[PDB]
Coordinates of C-alpha atoms (C1' of nucleotides) and ligand atoms in Angstrom, one line a residue:
Chain P
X1 CA 58.8 -56.7 -29.1
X2 CA 62.4 -57.6 -28.1
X3 CA 64.7 -60.6 -28.5
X4 CA 63.0 -62.6 -25.8
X5 CA 59.5 -62.1 -27.2
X6 CA 60.8 -63.2 -30.6
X7 CA 62.2 -66.4 -28.9
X8 CA 58.8 -67.0 -27.2
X9 CA 57.0 -66.6 -30.6
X10 CA 59.3 -69.1 -32.3
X11 CA 58.7 -71.6 -29.4
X12 CA 54.9 -71.4 -29.6
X13 CA 55.0 -71.5 -33.4
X14 CA 57.2 -74.5 -33.6
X15 CA 55.1 -76.2 -30.9
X16 CA 57.8 -76.4 -28.3
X17 CA 55.4 -74.8 -25.9
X18 CA 51.7 -74.1 -25.7
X19 CA 51.9 -71.8 -22.7
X20 CA 54.5 -69.4 -21.2
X21 CA 55.3 -69.5 -17.5
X22 CA 57.8 -67.0 -16.2
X23 CA 58.9 -65.9 -12.7
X24 CA 60.3 -63.0 -10.8
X25 CA 62.7 -64.4 -8.2
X26 CA 63.9 -61.7 -5.8
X27 CA 66.0 -62.7 -2.8
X28 CA 64.5 -61.0 0.3
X29 CA 67.7 -59.2 1.3
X30 CA 66.5 -55.7 0.7
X31 CA 63.8 -53.5 -0.9
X32 CA 63.0 -53.6 -4.5
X33 CA 64.2 -50.9 -6.9
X34 CA 63.6 -49.5 -10.4
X35 CA 66.0 -52.1 -11.8
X36 CA 63.8 -54.9 -10.3
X37 CA 60.8 -53.1 -11.8
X38 CA 62.4 -53.7 -15.3
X39 CA 62.4 -57.5 -14.4
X40 CA 58.8 -57.4 -13.0
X41 CA 57.5 -55.6 -16.1
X42 CA 59.3 -58.1 -18.3
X43 CA 58.3 -61.3 -16.5
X44 CA 54.7 -60.4 -15.6
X45 CA 54.1 -58.4 -18.8
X46 CA 55.0 -61.4 -21.0
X47 CA 52.8 -63.6 -18.8
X48 CA 49.7 -61.4 -19.3
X49 CA 50.3 -60.6 -23.0
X50 CA 50.6 -64.3 -23.9
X51 CA 47.8 -65.3 -21.4
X52 CA 50.4 -67.4 -19.4
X53 CA 51.4 -67.4 -15.8
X54 CA 54.1 -65.7 -13.7
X55 CA 55.1 -66.8 -10.2
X56 CA 56.5 -64.7 -7.4
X57 CA 59.2 -66.7 -5.8
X58 CA 61.3 -65.5 -2.9
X59 CA 64.8 -66.9 -3.6
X60 CA 65.5 -67.5 0.1
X61 CA 68.6 -69.7 0.2
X62 CA 70.8 -67.7 2.5
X63 CA 69.2 -66.9 5.9
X64 CA 72.0 -64.6 7.3
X65 CA 71.3 -62.0 4.6
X66 CA 67.4 -62.1 4.5
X67 CA 64.6 -60.9 6.7
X68 CA 60.8 -61.2 6.9
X69 CA 60.4 -57.4 6.5
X70 CA 61.7 -57.7 3.0
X71 CA 59.3 -60.4 1.9
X72 CA 56.4 -58.3 3.2
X73 CA 57.7 -55.2 1.3
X74 CA 58.5 -57.0 -2.0
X75 CA 54.9 -58.4 -2.1
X76 CA 53.7 -54.8 -1.5
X77 CA 55.6 -53.3 -4.4
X78 CA 54.9 -56.0 -7.0
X79 CA 51.1 -55.4 -6.4
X80 CA 51.5 -51.6 -6.4
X81 CA 53.0 -51.7 -9.9
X82 CA 49.8 -53.4 -10.9
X83 CA 50.9 -57.0 -11.3
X84 CA 49.5 -60.3 -9.9
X85 CA 51.3 -63.6 -9.4
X86 CA 50.2 -67.1 -10.2
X87 CA 48.7 -69.0 -7.3
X88 CA 50.3 -68.6 -3.9
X89 CA 53.6 -66.8 -3.2
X90 CA 56.4 -69.4 -3.7
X91 CA 59.6 -69.8 -1.8
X92 CA 62.8 -71.7 -2.6
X93 CA 62.6 -72.9 1.0
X94 CA 59.3 -74.7 0.1
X95 CA 61.6 -77.0 -2.0
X96 CA 64.3 -77.7 0.7
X97 CA 63.2 -81.3 1.3
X98 CA 63.1 -81.7 -2.5
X99 CA 66.5 -80.2 -3.0
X100 CA 68.0 -82.5 -0.4
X101 CA 66.6 -85.5 -2.2
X102 CA 68.1 -84.4 -5.4
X103 CA 71.5 -83.9 -3.7
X104 CA 71.3 -87.5 -2.5
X105 CA 70.5 -88.6 -6.1
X106 CA 73.7 -86.8 -7.3
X107 CA 75.7 -88.6 -4.5
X108 CA 74.3 -92.0 -5.5
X109 CA 75.4 -91.3 -9.1
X110 CA 78.9 -90.2 -8.0
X111 CA 78.4 -86.7 -9.4
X112 CA 78.7 -85.1 -5.9
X113 CA 80.9 -85.5 -2.8
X114 CA 81.5 -84.1 0.7
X115 CA 84.7 -82.0 0.4
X116 CA 86.6 -80.9 3.6
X117 CA 88.9 -78.3 2.1
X118 CA 88.7 -75.2 4.3
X119 CA 87.1 -72.0 2.9
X120 CA 90.5 -70.6 1.9
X121 CA 91.7 -73.9 0.4
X122 CA 88.8 -74.3 -2.0
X123 CA 89.8 -71.0 -3.5
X124 CA 93.5 -72.1 -3.8
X125 CA 92.5 -75.3 -5.5
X126 CA 90.0 -73.6 -7.9
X127 CA 92.7 -72.2 -10.2
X128 CA 92.5 -68.8 -11.7
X129 CA 91.0 -67.2 -14.9
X130 CA 94.1 -68.4 -16.8
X131 CA 95.2 -71.5 -14.9
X132 CA 93.1 -74.6 -14.4
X133 CA 92.2 -75.9 -10.9
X134 CA 93.1 -79.1 -9.2
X135 CA 91.2 -82.0 -7.6
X136 CA 90.5 -82.0 -3.9
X137 CA 92.1 -84.9 -2.0
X138 CA 88.6 -85.9 -0.8
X139 CA 87.1 -85.9 -4.4
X140 CA 87.1 -89.7 -4.7
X141 CA 85.2 -90.8 -1.6
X142 CA 82.8 -93.7 -2.0
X143 CA 79.1 -93.2 -2.5
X144 CA 78.6 -94.8 0.9
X145 CA 81.1 -92.3 2.4
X146 CA 79.6 -89.2 0.9
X147 CA 76.1 -90.4 2.1
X148 CA 77.3 -90.8 5.7
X149 CA 79.2 -87.4 5.7
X150 CA 76.3 -85.5 4.1
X151 CA 73.9 -87.0 6.6
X152 CA 76.4 -85.8 9.3
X153 CA 76.3 -82.4 7.7
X154 CA 72.5 -82.3 7.9
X155 CA 72.6 -83.5 11.5
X156 CA 74.9 -80.7 12.6
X157 CA 78.0 -82.8 13.3
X158 CA 80.2 -80.5 11.3
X159 CA 81.1 -76.8 12.2
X160 CA 80.5 -74.1 9.7
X161 CA 83.1 -74.2 6.9
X162 CA 84.4 -77.6 7.9
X163 CA 82.6 -79.4 5.1
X164 CA 80.4 -78.7 2.1
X165 CA 78.8 -80.8 -0.7
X166 CA 80.3 -80.2 -4.1
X167 CA 79.4 -81.2 -7.7
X168 CA 81.9 -83.5 -9.3
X169 CA 82.3 -81.8 -12.7
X170 CA 85.7 -80.6 -14.1
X171 CA 88.3 -78.7 -12.2
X172 CA 90.0 -77.7 -15.5
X173 CA 86.9 -76.3 -17.2
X174 CA 87.2 -72.8 -18.8
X175 CA 83.9 -71.9 -16.9
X176 CA 84.9 -71.2 -13.3
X177 CA 81.4 -72.1 -12.2
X178 CA 81.8 -75.7 -13.5
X179 CA 85.0 -76.3 -11.4
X180 CA 83.2 -78.4 -8.8
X181 CA 80.6 -75.9 -7.5
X182 CA 79.4 -76.0 -4.0
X183 CA 75.8 -77.4 -3.8
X184 CA 75.4 -77.2 0.0
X185 CA 77.1 -75.3 2.9
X186 CA 76.6 -75.2 6.7
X187 CA 74.9 -72.3 8.4
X188 CA 73.7 -72.6 12.0
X189 CA 71.3 -69.8 11.4
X190 CA 67.6 -69.5 11.8
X191 CA 65.6 -69.1 8.6
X192 CA 62.6 -66.6 8.3
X193 CA 60.5 -69.4 6.8
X194 CA 61.8 -72.8 8.0
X195 CA 63.1 -71.7 11.5
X196 CA 65.8 -74.0 12.8
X197 CA 64.8 -77.1 10.8
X198 CA 67.8 -76.8 8.6
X199 CA 71.5 -76.2 9.3
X200 CA 72.5 -76.9 5.7
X201 CA 71.3 -74.5 3.0
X202 CA 71.5 -74.9 -0.8
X203 CA 73.4 -72.6 -3.1
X204 CA 71.7 -70.5 -5.8
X205 CA 72.8 -72.5 -8.9
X206 CA 71.6 -75.8 -7.4
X207 CA 68.3 -74.2 -6.1
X208 CA 67.3 -72.1 -9.1
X209 CA 67.1 -74.6 -11.9
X210 CA 65.3 -77.3 -9.9
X211 CA 62.8 -74.7 -8.5
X212 CA 62.1 -73.5 -12.1
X213 CA 61.7 -77.1 -13.2
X214 CA 59.3 -78.0 -10.5
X215 CA 57.1 -75.0 -11.1
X216 CA 57.0 -75.7 -14.8
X217 CA 58.7 -72.4 -15.8
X218 CA 59.1 -72.3 -19.6
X219 CA 61.5 -69.3 -20.0
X220 CA 63.7 -68.4 -17.0
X221 CA 64.7 -64.8 -17.5
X222 CA 67.6 -63.3 -15.6
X223 CA 70.4 -60.7 -16.2
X224 CA 73.7 -61.0 -18.1
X225 CA 76.0 -62.0 -15.2
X226 CA 74.3 -65.5 -15.2
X227 CA 75.3 -66.4 -18.8
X228 CA 78.2 -68.5 -17.5
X229 CA 76.0 -70.0 -14.7
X230 CA 73.6 -71.3 -17.4
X231 CA 76.0 -74.1 -18.0
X232 CA 75.6 -75.3 -14.4
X233 CA 71.8 -74.7 -14.6
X234 CA 71.7 -77.2 -17.5
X235 CA 74.2 -79.7 -16.0
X236 CA 72.0 -80.0 -12.8
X237 CA 68.8 -80.6 -14.8
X238 CA 70.6 -83.1 -17.2
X239 CA 71.8 -85.2 -14.2
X240 CA 68.7 -85.5 -12.0
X241 CA 65.4 -87.2 -12.5
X242 CA 63.3 -84.2 -13.4
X243 CA 60.8 -84.2 -16.3
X244 CA 61.2 -80.7 -17.8
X245 CA 64.2 -78.5 -18.6
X246 CA 63.4 -74.7 -18.4
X247 CA 65.6 -72.5 -20.7
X248 CA 67.5 -69.5 -19.3
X249 CA 67.6 -66.3 -21.3
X250 CA 69.6 -63.3 -20.2
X251 CA 69.0 -59.6 -20.7
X252 CA 71.1 -56.5 -19.7
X253 CA 70.4 -54.8 -16.4
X254 CA 69.2 -51.2 -15.8
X255 CA 71.7 -48.7 -14.6
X256 CA 70.3 -45.2 -13.9
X257 CA 72.4 -42.1 -14.1
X258 CA 73.2 -40.3 -10.8
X259 CA 72.2 -43.3 -8.6
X260 CA 73.3 -46.7 -7.3
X261 CA 71.2 -49.9 -7.8
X262 CA 73.5 -52.2 -5.7
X263 CA 71.6 -53.4 -2.6
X264 CA 74.9 -53.5 -0.7
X265 CA 75.3 -49.8 -1.3
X266 CA 71.6 -48.9 -0.8
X267 CA 71.7 -50.7 2.5
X268 CA 74.8 -48.6 3.5
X269 CA 72.8 -45.4 2.8
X270 CA 70.1 -46.7 5.1
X271 CA 72.3 -48.2 7.8
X272 CA 74.6 -45.2 8.1
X273 CA 71.5 -42.9 8.2
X274 CA 72.4 -40.8 5.1
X275 CA 68.8 -41.2 4.0
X276 CA 65.6 -41.6 6.2
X277 CA 65.1 -45.2 5.2
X278 CA 64.6 -47.5 2.2
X279 CA 61.6 -45.5 1.1
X280 CA 63.3 -42.1 1.3
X281 CA 62.2 -39.9 -1.7
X282 CA 65.8 -39.7 -3.0
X283 CA 66.1 -43.6 -3.1
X284 CA 65.7 -45.4 -6.4
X285 CA 63.6 -48.1 -4.6
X286 CA 60.0 -48.6 -5.7
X287 CA 58.7 -47.5 -2.3
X288 CA 61.0 -44.5 -2.4
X289 CA 59.7 -43.5 -5.9
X290 CA 56.1 -44.0 -4.7
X291 CA 56.6 -41.7 -1.7
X292 CA 58.4 -39.2 -4.1
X293 CA 55.1 -39.0 -6.2
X294 CA 55.8 -41.5 -9.0
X295 CA 52.8 -43.4 -10.2
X296 CA 52.9 -47.1 -11.0
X297 CA 51.9 -46.3 -14.6
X298 CA 54.8 -43.9 -15.1
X299 CA 57.2 -46.7 -14.0
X300 CA 55.5 -49.2 -16.4
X301 CA 55.9 -46.7 -19.2
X302 CA 59.6 -46.2 -18.3
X303 CA 60.2 -50.0 -18.6
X304 CA 58.3 -50.0 -22.0
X305 CA 60.6 -47.2 -23.3
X306 CA 64.0 -48.5 -22.2
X307 CA 63.5 -51.9 -23.9
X308 CA 65.0 -55.3 -23.3
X309 CA 68.3 -56.0 -25.1
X310 CA 71.7 -57.5 -24.3
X311 CA 73.5 -54.2 -24.5
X312 CA 75.0 -52.7 -21.4
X313 CA 73.3 -49.4 -20.8
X314 CA 72.9 -46.4 -18.6
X315 CA 69.7 -44.5 -18.9
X316 CA 69.7 -40.7 -18.2
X317 CA 67.4 -39.3 -15.4
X318 CA 65.8 -37.2 -18.1
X319 CA 64.1 -40.3 -19.5
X320 CA 62.6 -41.3 -16.1
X321 CA 61.4 -37.7 -15.4
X322 CA 59.8 -37.5 -18.9
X323 CA 57.6 -40.5 -17.9
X324 CA 56.1 -39.0 -14.7
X325 CA 55.8 -35.4 -16.2
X326 CA 53.7 -36.9 -19.1
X327 CA 51.3 -38.8 -16.7
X328 CA 51.0 -36.0 -14.2
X329 CA 50.6 -33.2 -16.8
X330 CA 47.5 -35.1 -17.8
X331 CA 46.0 -36.1 -14.5
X332 CA 47.2 -33.7 -11.8
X333 CA 44.9 -30.8 -10.8
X334 CA 46.6 -27.4 -10.6
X335 CA 47.1 -25.4 -7.5
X336 CA 48.9 -22.3 -6.2
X337 CA 51.8 -22.4 -3.8
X338 CA 54.7 -20.1 -3.1
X339 CA 57.9 -21.8 -2.0
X340 CA 60.0 -18.7 -1.2
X341 CA 57.6 -15.9 -0.2
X342 CA 57.9 -12.1 -0.1
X343 CA 54.9 -9.9 0.8
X344 CA 53.2 -7.9 -1.8
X345 CA 50.6 -5.4 -0.6
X346 CA 48.3 -3.7 -3.0
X347 CA 47.8 -0.2 -1.6
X348 CA 45.1 0.4 -4.2
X349 CA 43.0 -2.6 -2.9
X350 CA 39.7 -1.9 -1.2
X351 CA 37.8 -4.4 1.0
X352 CA 38.8 -7.6 2.9
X353 CA 39.0 -9.8 -0.1
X354 CA 37.0 -11.4 -2.9
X355 CA 36.7 -14.8 -4.6
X356 CA 38.3 -15.6 -8.0
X357 CA 37.5 -18.7 -10.2
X358 CA 40.5 -20.8 -11.0
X359 CA 40.7 -23.9 -13.3
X360 CA 41.6 -27.3 -11.8
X361 CA 43.2 -27.9 -15.2
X362 CA 43.9 -25.1 -17.8
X363 CA 43.6 -27.3 -20.9
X364 CA 40.8 -29.6 -19.6
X365 CA 37.5 -27.8 -18.6
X366 CA 35.9 -31.2 -17.6
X367 CA 38.1 -31.4 -14.5
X368 CA 36.1 -28.5 -13.1
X369 CA 37.1 -25.4 -11.2
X370 CA 37.2 -24.0 -7.7
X371 CA 36.9 -20.7 -5.9
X372 CA 40.2 -19.2 -4.6
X373 CA 40.4 -16.1 -2.4
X374 CA 42.0 -12.9 -3.5
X375 CA 43.2 -10.1 -1.2
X376 CA 45.2 -6.9 -1.0
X377 CA 48.1 -8.5 0.8
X378 CA 49.3 -11.5 -1.2
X379 CA 52.5 -13.6 -1.3
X380 CA 54.6 -14.0 -4.3
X381 CA 57.9 -15.8 -4.9
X382 CA 61.1 -13.7 -4.5
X383 CA 62.4 -14.9 -7.9
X384 CA 59.4 -13.2 -9.5
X385 CA 60.2 -9.7 -8.4
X386 CA 63.2 -8.2 -10.1
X387 CA 64.0 -4.6 -9.2
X388 CA 66.2 -4.3 -12.3
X389 CA 65.8 -6.6 -15.3
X390 CA 66.2 -7.1 -19.1
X391 CA 63.7 -7.7 -21.8
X392 CA 63.7 -11.6 -21.5
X393 CA 62.5 -11.4 -17.9
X394 CA 58.7 -11.3 -18.2
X395 CA 57.8 -11.3 -14.5
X396 CA 57.4 -8.3 -12.1
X397 CA 59.8 -5.5 -12.5
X398 CA 59.8 -2.3 -10.3
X399 CA 58.7 -0.3 -13.3
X400 CA 56.0 -2.3 -15.0
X401 CA 52.9 -4.6 -14.7
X402 CA 52.3 -8.4 -14.5
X403 CA 49.3 -10.6 -14.6
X404 CA 48.5 -12.5 -11.3
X405 CA 47.5 -16.0 -12.1
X406 CA 43.7 -16.1 -12.9
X407 CA 43.4 -12.6 -11.2
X408 CA 44.4 -9.0 -11.7
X409 CA 47.1 -7.1 -13.5
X410 CA 49.0 -5.4 -10.7
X411 CA 51.9 -2.9 -11.1
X412 CA 55.1 -2.5 -9.1
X413 CA 55.5 1.0 -7.6
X414 CA 57.7 1.0 -4.5
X415 CA 59.8 -1.6 -2.9
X416 CA 60.6 -1.5 0.9
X417 CA 63.8 -3.0 2.1
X418 CA 64.8 -3.7 5.8
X419 CA 68.3 -2.9 6.9
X420 CA 70.4 -5.6 5.3
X421 CA 69.7 -4.7 1.7
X422 CA 67.0 -7.4 1.4
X423 CA 63.4 -6.8 0.3
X424 CA 60.6 -7.2 2.9
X425 CA 57.5 -5.9 1.1
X426 CA 56.6 -4.8 -2.5
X427 CA 54.0 -2.1 -3.0
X428 CA 51.8 -2.4 -6.0
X429 CA 48.6 -0.9 -7.5
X430 CA 46.1 -3.1 -9.3
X431 CA 43.8 -2.3 -12.2
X432 CA 40.2 -3.0 -11.0
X433 CA 39.4 -4.3 -14.5
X434 CA 41.9 -6.7 -16.1
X435 CA 39.6 -9.8 -16.3
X436 CA 54.0 -12.6 -18.3
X437 CA 52.1 -14.2 -15.4
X438 CA 53.1 -15.0 -11.8
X439 CA 51.5 -17.3 -9.2
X440 CA 50.4 -16.0 -5.8
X441 CA 48.8 -16.9 -2.5
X442 CA 46.6 -14.5 -0.5
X443 CA 48.3 -14.0 2.9
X444 CA 45.1 -13.8 4.9
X445 CA 43.9 -17.1 3.6
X446 CA 47.3 -18.8 3.2
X447 CA 47.9 -22.3 4.5
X448 CA 51.5 -22.7 6.0
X449 CA 53.1 -25.5 4.2
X450 CA 56.5 -27.3 4.4
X451 CA 57.9 -28.0 0.9
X452 CA 60.7 -30.5 0.3
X453 CA 62.6 -29.9 -2.8
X454 CA 64.5 -33.0 -3.9
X455 CA 67.4 -33.4 -6.3
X456 CA 69.7 -36.2 -7.4
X457 CA 71.2 -38.1 -4.5
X458 CA 74.7 -38.0 -6.0
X459 CA 76.8 -35.3 -7.7
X460 CA 78.4 -37.6 -10.3
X461 CA 76.8 -39.7 -13.2
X462 CA 78.1 -43.0 -12.0
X463 CA 78.5 -43.0 -8.2
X464 CA 79.0 -46.8 -8.4
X465 CA 82.3 -46.3 -10.1
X466 CA 83.6 -44.0 -7.3
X467 CA 86.1 -45.3 -4.7
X468 CA 83.9 -44.0 -2.0
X469 CA 80.3 -43.4 -3.3
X470 CA 79.3 -41.8 0.0
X471 CA 81.8 -38.9 -0.3
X472 CA 80.2 -38.1 -3.7
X473 CA 76.6 -37.6 -2.1
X474 CA 75.0 -34.3 -3.2
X475 CA 74.7 -32.0 -0.2
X476 CA 71.7 -30.3 -1.8
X477 CA 69.6 -33.5 -2.5
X478 CA 67.1 -32.2 0.0
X479 CA 66.4 -28.6 0.7
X480 CA 63.5 -27.9 3.0
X481 CA 61.5 -24.7 2.5
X482 CA 58.6 -23.1 4.4
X483 CA 56.1 -21.6 2.0
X484 CA 52.4 -20.9 1.7
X485 CA 49.8 -22.8 -0.2
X486 CA 46.2 -21.8 -1.2
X487 CA 43.6 -22.9 1.4
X488 CA 42.1 -25.7 -0.8
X489 CA 45.2 -27.8 -0.3
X490 CA 43.9 -28.4 3.3
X491 CA 41.9 -31.3 1.8
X492 CA 44.9 -32.8 0.0
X493 CA 45.5 -36.5 0.6
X494 CA 48.6 -38.6 0.4
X495 CA 49.2 -40.3 -2.9
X496 CA 47.5 -37.5 -4.9
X497 CA 49.8 -35.4 -7.1
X498 CA 49.1 -31.7 -7.7
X499 CA 50.8 -29.4 -10.1
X500 CA 51.8 -26.3 -8.2
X501 CA 51.7 -24.0 -11.2
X502 CA 55.1 -22.8 -12.5
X503 CA 57.0 -24.9 -9.9
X504 CA 56.3 -28.6 -10.6
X505 CA 54.5 -31.6 -9.4
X506 CA 54.1 -32.1 -5.6
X507 CA 52.4 -34.6 -3.3
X508 CA 51.6 -34.9 0.4
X509 CA 54.3 -36.8 2.1
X510 CA 52.7 -39.5 4.3
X511 CA 55.4 -39.6 7.0
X512 CA 56.0 -36.0 8.0
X513 CA 52.7 -34.2 7.3
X514 CA 50.1 -33.5 10.0
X515 CA 47.1 -31.2 9.9
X516 CA 49.0 -28.7 12.0
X517 CA 51.6 -28.6 9.2
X518 CA 51.4 -30.3 5.7
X519 CA 54.5 -31.5 4.0
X520 CA 54.7 -31.6 0.2
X521 CA 57.4 -33.5 -1.6
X522 CA 58.4 -32.3 -5.0
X523 CA 58.1 -35.3 -7.3
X524 CA 59.6 -33.6 -10.3
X525 CA 60.1 -29.9 -11.4
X526 CA 58.4 -28.5 -14.5
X527 CA 60.4 -28.2 -17.8
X528 CA 62.5 -25.1 -17.1
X529 CA 63.9 -23.1 -20.1
Chain Q
rG1 C1' 91.3 -68.6 -20.3
rG2 C1' 86.0 -68.6 -21.1
rG3 C1' 81.3 -66.3 -21.7
rG4 C1' 79.0 -61.7 -23.9
rU5 C1' 78.3 -56.8 -26.5
rA6 C1' 79.2 -52.8 -30.5
rU7 C1' 73.7 -48.6 -34.8
rC8 C1' 72.7 -40.4 -32.9
rG9 C1' 74.5 -37.0 -26.6
rC10 C1' 71.3 -41.4 -23.8
rC11 C1' 68.2 -45.6 -25.1
rA12 C1' 66.4 -48.5 -29.4
rA13 C1' 64.4 -50.7 -34.3
rG14 C1' 66.5 -53.2 -38.3
rC15 C1' 67.3 -60.4 -39.8
rG16 C1' 70.5 -58.9 -48.4
rG17 C1' 66.4 -54.0 -51.3
rU18 C1' 68.9 -47.9 -49.7
rA19 C1' 69.2 -46.0 -41.5
rA20 C1' 62.0 -46.4 -37.5
rG21 C1' 60.6 -44.6 -32.7
rG22 C1' 61.5 -42.4 -27.7
rC23 C1' 64.4 -39.1 -24.3
rA24 C1' 67.7 -34.8 -24.9
rC25 C1' 69.0 -30.5 -28.1
rC26 C1' 68.1 -26.3 -31.9
rG27 C1' 64.6 -23.4 -34.2
rG28 C1' 59.4 -21.2 -35.4
rA29 C1' 53.5 -20.9 -34.4
rU30 C1' 49.8 -20.5 -30.5
rU31 C1' 49.1 -20.1 -24.8
rC32 C1' 46.8 -16.2 -18.4
rU33 C1' 52.1 -21.6 -16.4
rG34 C1' 59.4 -19.6 -19.7
rA35 C1' 54.5 -25.6 -18.7
rU36 C1' 51.3 -28.3 -22.2
rU37 C1' 50.1 -28.3 -27.6
rC38 C1' 51.6 -27.7 -33.0
rC39 C1' 55.1 -27.5 -36.7
rG40 C1' 60.1 -28.4 -38.4
rG41 C1' 65.2 -29.8 -37.8
rC42 C1' 68.4 -33.4 -36.0
rA43 C1' 72.8 -41.1 -38.6
rU44 C1' 74.9 -40.2 -47.3
rU45 C1' 75.8 -44.1 -42.6
rC46 C1' 76.0 -48.5 -38.5
rC47 C1' 83.4 -50.1 -33.7
rG48 C1' 87.8 -50.4 -37.9
rA49 C1' 90.2 -52.4 -42.3
rG50 C1' 89.6 -55.4 -46.3
rG51 C1' 86.4 -58.8 -49.3
rU52 C1' 81.4 -61.1 -51.6
rU53 C1' 77.1 -59.1 -54.0
rC54 C1' 73.4 -55.4 -59.0
rG55 C1' 72.6 -54.0 -53.9
rA56 C1' 75.7 -55.0 -47.0
rA57 C1' 74.2 -52.1 -40.5
rU58 C1' 72.8 -57.4 -42.2
rC59 C1' 77.1 -62.2 -45.4
rC60 C1' 82.7 -63.4 -45.0
rU61 C1' 87.4 -62.3 -43.2
rC62 C1' 91.1 -60.0 -39.9
rG63 C1' 91.6 -56.5 -36.1
rU64 C1' 89.9 -53.2 -31.9
rA65 C1' 87.0 -51.4 -27.6
rC66 C1' 84.1 -52.4 -23.5
rC67 C1' 81.2 -55.6 -19.9
rC68 C1' 80.9 -60.5 -16.8
rC69 C1' 83.3 -65.0 -14.1
rA70 C1' 88.4 -67.1 -9.5
rG71 C1' 81.8 -66.4 -2.4
rC72 C1' 80.8 -72.1 1.5
rC73 C1' 76.5 -64.6 -2.1
rA74 C1' 72.4 -64.1 -5.5
Ligands
LIG1 N1 69.4 -53.5 -12.1 C1 68.6 -54.5 -12.5 N2 68.1 -54.5 -13.8 C2 67.3 -55.5 -14.2 N3 67.0 -56.6 -13.6 C3 67.6 -56.6 -12.3 C4 68.3 -55.6 -11.8 N4 68.7 -56.0 -10.5 C5 68.2 -57.1 -10.3 N5 67.4 -57.6 -11.4 C6 66.7 -58.9 -11.5 O1 65.7 -59.1 -10.5 C7 65.8 -60.4 -10.0 C8 66.0 -60.4 -8.5 O2 67.2 -59.8 -8.1 P1 67.7 -60.1 -6.5 O3 66.5 -59.8 -5.7 O4 68.4 -61.4 -6.5 O5 68.8 -58.9 -6.2 P2 70.1 -58.6 -7.0 O6 70.1 -57.1 -7.3 O7 70.3 -59.5 -8.1 O8 71.3 -58.9 -5.9 P3 71.6 -58.0 -4.6 O9 70.4 -58.3 -3.8 O10 72.9 -58.5 -4.1 O11 71.7 -56.6 -5.1 C9 66.9 -61.2 -10.8 O12 66.3 -61.9 -11.9 C10 67.7 -60.0 -11.2 O13 68.4 -60.4 -12.5

RNA sequence: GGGGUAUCGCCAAGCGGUAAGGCACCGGAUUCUGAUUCCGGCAUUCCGAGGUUCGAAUCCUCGUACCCCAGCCA
């Protein structure tokens, strides 16, 4: 429960409504992100909990900023999260003939007019936050004149910016949005849905309330920057012949630590090629999080945990990571992979190898097991052999023993350097019966694997507040390693998360991996202490 | 000028009856993953000052801090 669900309960109880009908109205000017997922979980979640309906509506009122690629991808991500919309996909452009008719109704009532103040002059006449505005010299044209000039606008007789339709409200209102807001403006631009049928396009505040009213939306839920705009949402519906009046309720937006939500900024990261694309694993977009290894269920759990309030907030990345670690700790089958290898030969080992049994999940025997090859020459991680180390360090020291994961207790004996002080091969002796711990991969059976270790895209907690957010990009947000994985990962598929024991959760990147060389993205590292 | 918001490091419940829960953090048990799991600890106090009340985070003052609005963007 939250404040909006308490409102909906009061509405049903009082008998104001019998059903709830919500909507998610994204403009198709970019890809969806985790902030949009908070609005999807809210709107579609309420609709299914109350056995109501929720429409997907593309708020496509500005052609020069939108593209068909984005309507295809938004539909893809809404479904991926596990949500279904009511009836067909809706568009604000489906109501363009309807919106034009309601504009003519406002003109016939004298509550709208064609203004010819230039784009800079409308700002001059609008007043400021402390000073009231002033009436346009074209504000008092007759109904018959506004009708002729609006038809001329629709016919293409005016150049862009040379005229616009305005609501006649109050230029001295304390709400800047009620100081004669523009209803229509001219754009000689092709629309991804309606082609070149229209050269006049409606503004958001005129489009949104009428679109909600025609769809029978009961509770229109948007973010806090639209609280002022609610006054125009209600003025439009109180002045046209429409039978219902949807109510707008605002909640605070999601801000995530170490990342930007702004589609203007996300588009600059894509355009200037600082990330691979909109679905790059470092992106906060839904498709980026999917390719990183996040499950839809972990994102729905995140939205459930952060809540819906009116408080400005900034969630820590630790909260997001906790959600996917919880899911994947349960469902991801374990495997062995070494990200930074160093060779370890066991001089004491006799034969060409054997086959050891390893659990697909240490705390769940029902997930089964598999046979993994052991050998004399294995690969371990460099960080697990310390030539000299204190009592806290429980891994392989040049003096003592360690347990190999699910295999033998070996024992460091002699290291062998190269020339530049670095180690090339460790020499150990195993104990034929011994069945901390370190993970390993037999060199003879090792699959060569490319591992992509991701970190936060920015080096500061609020890159949005920076003067240049690009100059605060983390240079180590992607470090590519070449390691070795156990041979069973040959049958790994994209969109299947594995826990590489003692490293984290990884998944096959479906963009860079082949059969000749797999690529594993690191979704999230394990809890390191 | 107007619209909004203040409760733990971050997020959040609470609607006149004695400050839930999650993430993070500090312990301590068990583990062939420094993981998981378990156990326990984390707000005498709610933006501040005053008032009402037997009793106030809730009510009433008066202050303060922060967020949003001056696109022919959404
Ligand atoms: N960060 C966010 N947190 C919560 N809801 C959000 C967030 N960003 C957008 N929404 C909601 O999702 C819906 C669609 O947003 P929309 O597609 O118009 O993009 P936008 O982020 O609002 O603007 P822009 O495209 O310029 O970034 C709106 O109801 C909006 O309030």
